[PDB]
Design a protein around this ligand. Sequence first.
Ligand code: FGR
Length: 602
Amino acid sequence: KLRYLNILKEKLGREPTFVELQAFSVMWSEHCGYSHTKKYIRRLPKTGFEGNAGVVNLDDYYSVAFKIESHNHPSAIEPYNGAATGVGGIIRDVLAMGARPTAIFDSLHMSRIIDGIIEGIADYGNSIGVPTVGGELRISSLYAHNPLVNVLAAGVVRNDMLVDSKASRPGQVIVIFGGATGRDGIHGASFASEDLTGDKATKLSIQVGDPFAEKMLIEAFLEMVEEGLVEGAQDLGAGGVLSATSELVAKGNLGAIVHLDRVPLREPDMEPWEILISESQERMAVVTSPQKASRILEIARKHLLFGDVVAEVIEEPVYRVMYRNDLVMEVPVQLLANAPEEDIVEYTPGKIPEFKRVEFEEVNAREVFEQYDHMVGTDTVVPPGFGAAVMRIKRDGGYSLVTHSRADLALQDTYWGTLIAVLESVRKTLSVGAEPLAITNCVNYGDPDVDPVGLSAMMTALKNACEFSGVPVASGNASLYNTYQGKPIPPTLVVGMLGKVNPQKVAKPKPSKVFAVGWNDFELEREKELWRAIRKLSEEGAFILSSSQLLTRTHVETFREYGLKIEVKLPEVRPAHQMVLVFSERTPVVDVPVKEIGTLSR
Ligand SMILES: O=CNCC(=O)N[C@@H]1O[C@H](COP(=O)(O)O)[C@@H](O)[C@H]1O
């Protein structure tokens, strides 16, 4: 902050004004600026080039837009609103990609089932009519003061209706529409970067959501896309108007003139800086020509929303904020969009260590989502309780969604633990017969200034694990300064993996013999052999379970849905192993260890 305050002063050639200080505190906060993670992120193999980030072609006609986000900070302060708006936020991300939101896969890490967090997710999900197709839940006392709420959202989008994420020429205007702007979430970006949860950020920082408006938002926006009206888009989240407008024009190397007086307000006595920095929910920024702006506003207002043309895209790369004829702030756009970059730590992996059994706790979110009329994975090819969510795109087309993490391991060795989490994400995907296509990741870390190695260790293994598996990063999020009184959370990388699968080829469980396929321990040089064995057996029609516990309660519960009973003698396994459970009529034949352990019947 201080080091940053002094650079701004360098750059500005004076001290900032009140407005500029609120502005850069937002844009230059770890949350918005990614100071510590920008360089590590660049080294990541990405689905980048592919015009649009988070967008992955499925069959040359349809693509899957997906991304995982977090709302850890706010969820610790206000479980309900923080968790709810957590989903509201990531949903708007997939919508801005041009895709109709279709699925939500949550990844929760708490010291116990925090009602408010589970209910904020269920209510908001139910009101927007977007199903939760799965959920990863980890309970550990290590997340007591900093629960982790990571939400993955995915959507189907036509390859010929991809929306851009930037402004492209002088003369375009930017429309802000959706719910009216208020004071909520003001400074939440900085609140979410606060080296500590017990810092000067509180209730004035958490956003309030309203799914009814969000529902209206997707309808309005998709109709805008379908009418060739949207030439660019970016949802309003952290930093609100400021963040959306500056980045949109920043990405296109253009500038902008913002008219805050044009921002539909919910609270008319707000000051100009509050309008600029407000983080009110359910809002979207649209880049377009002056001609299409009328139809856009017509559509927005017709869907019971509010909106007006707020900014003009200019050639000069300056960010000029006006309020009527008053000049509120004026700074170089690229100054605001390029927070100071931190040098990184070169991390060289050590010997794979022997992991100790770190007692954690899992639980089928479905069993916990009933209390709040929220069904998990009711419309999927096969139950997500078996390891992966499989959704239908077409009769003979589909995709899978997987959310995995291994903080229990990473806590002992961030590199290997983290790297293992991803490989295991590959096993899950392959196990349902899906082909790994891309990853969306959420980096949840502590304080990078106090511990730079742990971050590097996490980011470098994501790189290596992507290189090893050949599965690139399509999108993602970084959440740092996830601490309390300095007490850091366990380094948790959440891997969201997208796979391609034909709904017709997905196996269902039925009476069969059970075999433990693989090794009881881990060696990087045989992982691909395990994948090969899984690919072969899946092709032959085998049902396959890939779990750290080999067989979980959720599993036993899911088999119940088929009236099937499982009786086996689980092999002794280490915290990190390379073994999968295979169900078939005959003994599996692969070049990997095979042991018959029991049966599935009734
Ligand atoms: O509603 C929009 N959500 C989008 C968004 O950008 N939200 C911002 O992220 C913070 C949580 O970050 P974390 O503690 O999870 O790292 C939250 O407080 C918002 O400022």
